[PDB]
Amino acid sequence: RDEGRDVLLFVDNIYRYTLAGTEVSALLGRMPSAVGYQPTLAEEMGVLQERITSTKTGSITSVQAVYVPADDLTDPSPATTFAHLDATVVLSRQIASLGIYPAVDPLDSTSRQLDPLVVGQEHYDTARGVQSILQRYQELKDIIAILGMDELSEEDKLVVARARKIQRFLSQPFFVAEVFTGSPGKYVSLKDTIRGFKGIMEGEYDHLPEQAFYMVGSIEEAVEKAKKL
Amino acid sequence: EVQPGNVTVLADTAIRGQDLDEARAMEAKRKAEEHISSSHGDVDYAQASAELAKAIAQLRVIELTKKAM
Missing domain, CATH: 3.40.50.300 (P-loop containing nucleotide triphosphate hydrolases)
Structure with a gap:
C-alpha cells in the first residue's frame, strides 16, 4: 500500500x-x-x-x-x-x-x-423497493401460516407472489460451486440485476411461475427456463 | 293451483307488484354504484373474528421459529 x-x-x-x-x-x-x-x-x-x-x-x-x-x-x-x-x-x-x-x-x-447520491437513483429505488416488498412479505408470513393464503386481500396476495419471485431471483449458481453441484455457474451485470428486479416489481414477469426465477442469471434466463418448465 | 286431487297455494313471502319491485330493483342498482358497508347479522363471527385479528396480529411467531416459506 x-x-x-x-x-x-x-x-x-x-x-x-x-x-x-x-x-x-x-x-x-x-x-x-x-x-x-x-x-x-x-x-x-x-x-x-x-x-x-x-x-x-x-x-x-x-x-x-x-x-x-x-x-x-x-x-x-x-x-x-x-x-x-x-x-x-x-x-x-x-x-x-x-x-x-x-x-x-x-x-x-x-x-x-447504498446511497442515492452515490449509486444513482435507479439502483437505490430498486434496492429499497425490493427491500420493502420483501419485508412486507415477512409480516404477512404469520397470518398465512395460521389462516392460509385465501385470507389475504387480492393485493397482499399479489405482494407475496411478487416477493417470492424476488426471493428466488436473488439466487444464482457460482462457478466455484460447480464442483459439488451440477449447476454450471453464471455472472450477472450490475446493469441486468437492476433491469430484472425493477422489472419483476413493476409486474412485467408475473405470468411466469416461481421456479422460472430460481437459480438463473439475467431475467432472459428466467424467461427461457419458464419454457422448459 | 287446483288440479285433479290436489291444490297448492304458492305464496309470496312479501307483497309483490310492479311498483314495489322496481323499487327494490332501483335500490339494488344504487347500492352497487356506491361501494358501501352493511352489517351481516352474525355477532358470533364478529367479536370472534376481531379477537382472532388482535391475537394473531404483531406476533413475530413465524420469525421466532425457523420455518420455510
Whole structure:
C-alpha cells in the first residue's frame, strides 16, 4: 500500500483471530468479559481492523469472512465487528434451508454506500423497493401460516407472489460451486440485476411461475427456463 | 293451483307488484354504484373474528421459529 496504490486483501475468519485471543485470555490472567470473552475484545478487534484502510499513498479493497458463533448475531464477536465494515452482507441458515445458495438475507444485509447520491437513483429505488416488498412479505408470513393464503386481500396476495419471485431471483449458481453441484455457474451485470428486479416489481414477469426465477442469471434466463418448465 | 286431487297455494313471502319491485330493483342498482358497508347479522363471527385479528396480529411467531416459506 505505502508504495503501489491498489491492493486486495482477503481474510478468512477474522473470528478465528479473536477466538484465538480467547483461548489465551484465561491464561494471560485477566477476568472474563461477557460470555467468557476477553475484556479486550473491543480493542483487539479495533487494532487489527483499523489497520486496513485507504491511505493517501494507496488504497486497500478487502473482503473478509467473519464467522458468527451458534448463529447468534448478538454474540460479541459479530456484534462489535459490525461497526468496522463499509458493506455488511449476512448469510442466514433459514435462507439456505430453502435452496437459495447465495444465502444472503437481503433484509439484515446492508452497505453504508447504498446511497442515492452515490449509486444513482435507479439502483437505490430498486434496492429499497425490493427491500420493502420483501419485508412486507415477512409480516404477512404469520397470518398465512395460521389462516392460509385465501385470507389475504387480492393485493397482499399479489405482494407475496411478487416477493417470492424476488426471493428466488436473488439466487444464482457460482462457478466455484460447480464442483459439488451440477449447476454450471453464471455472472450477472450490475446493469441486468437492476433491469430484472425493477422489472419483476413493476409486474412485467408475473405470468411466469416461481421456479422460472430460481437459480438463473439475467431475467432472459428466467424467461427461457419458464419454457422448459 | 287446483288440479285433479290436489291444490297448492304458492305464496309470496312479501307483497309483490310492479311498483314495489322496481323499487327494490332501483335500490339494488344504487347500492352497487356506491361501494358501501352493511352489517351481516352474525355477532358470533364478529367479536370472534376481531379477537382472532388482535391475537394473531404483531406476533413475530413465524420469525421466532425457523420455518420455510
